[PDB]
Paper text:
Here, we report the crystal structures of a 207-residue MSLN fragment, of fl-MSLN alone and in complex with a therapeutic mAb MORAb-009, as well as the structure of its C-terminal shed-resistant peptide complexed with mAb 15B6. By truncation and alanine replacement mutagenesis, the CA-125 binding site was mapped to a 64-residue fragment at the N-terminus of MSLN. The N-terminal half of mesothelin is conformationally rigid, suitable for eliciting specific antibodies, whereas its C-terminal portion is more flexible.
The tumor-associated antigen mesothelin is expressed at high levels on the cell surface of many human cancers, while its expression in normal tissues is limited. The binding of mesothelin to the tumor-associated cancer antigen 125 (CA-125) can lead to heterotypic cell adhesion and tumor metastasis within the pleural and peritoneal cavities. Here, we report the crystal structures of mesothelin that reveal a compact, right-handed solenoid consisting of 24 short helices and connecting loops. These helices form a nine-layered spiral coil that resembles ARM/HEAT family proteins.
Residue numbers in the entry: 299 to 507
Write the structure that this text describes.
């Protein structure tokens, strides 16, 4: 079937659409309307197949990848994305990253979230302070999951996002990379605070009994 029943053409994304059959959603809901009103989808308890119809509509409308104007409102529909879907995204806002990471809370990192994080950080050109705040907030061992080579390109400003417990899983090679960056970043600290906060970057426990 390829024709919307009379009077069923959707002019809004609203609760009435939950009663539509799958083919009715396909024939009656325009993809541009859906994309424009993604901020209303997650409050509407569509079934899995209904949401699959909507996701396919977005895929059809955006073969080159959803725009961030839609991504920022995907919500739990993020869990229906494939890694390939996410590789096309250009995500620049940290509010979008926080919104997407919130719906994955309580679970291990999936390939989808890994792709999302990797593409976001590469798009910013570096791991900046606020991004590291967010990533650590959702994944405490993110910083020390990076190799020394990866850590070497982290700007010292981002050290201000590094909390002492974040360094527990780091080894002396990673800490050899991070400690000089921390020396530079804490230039403007008061002496007492500097002495306290610098210690975790030395990882003394790795070197004595």
């Amino acid at each position: 079937k390829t024709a919307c029943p009379s009077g069923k053409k959707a002019r809004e994304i609203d609760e009435s659409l939950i009663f539509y059959k799958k083919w009715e959603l396909e024939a009656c809901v325009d993809a541009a309307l859906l994309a424009t009103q993604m901020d209303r989808v997650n409050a509407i308890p569509f079934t899995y197949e209904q949401l699959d119809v909507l996701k396919h509509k977005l895929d059809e409308l955006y073969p080159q990848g959803y725009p961030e104007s839609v991504i920022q409102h995907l919500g739990y529909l993020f869990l229906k994305m494939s890694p390939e879907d996410i590789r096309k995204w250009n995500v620049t806002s940290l509010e979008t990253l926080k919104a997407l990471l919130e719906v994955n809370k309580g679970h291990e990192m999936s390939p989808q979230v890994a792709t999302l994080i990797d593409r976001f950080v590469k798009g910013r050109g570096q791991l900046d302070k606020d991004t590291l705040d967010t990533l650590t907030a959702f994944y405490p061992g993110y910083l020390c999951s990076l190799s020394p080579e990866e850590l070497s390109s982290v700007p010292p400003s981002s050290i201000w996002a590094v909390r002492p417990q974040d360094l527990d899983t780091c080894d002396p090679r990673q800490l050899d990379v991070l400690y000089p960056k921390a020396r530079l970043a804490f230039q403007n600290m008061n002496g007492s605070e500097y002495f306290v906060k610098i210690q975790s970057f030395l990882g003394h426990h790795h070197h004595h009994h």
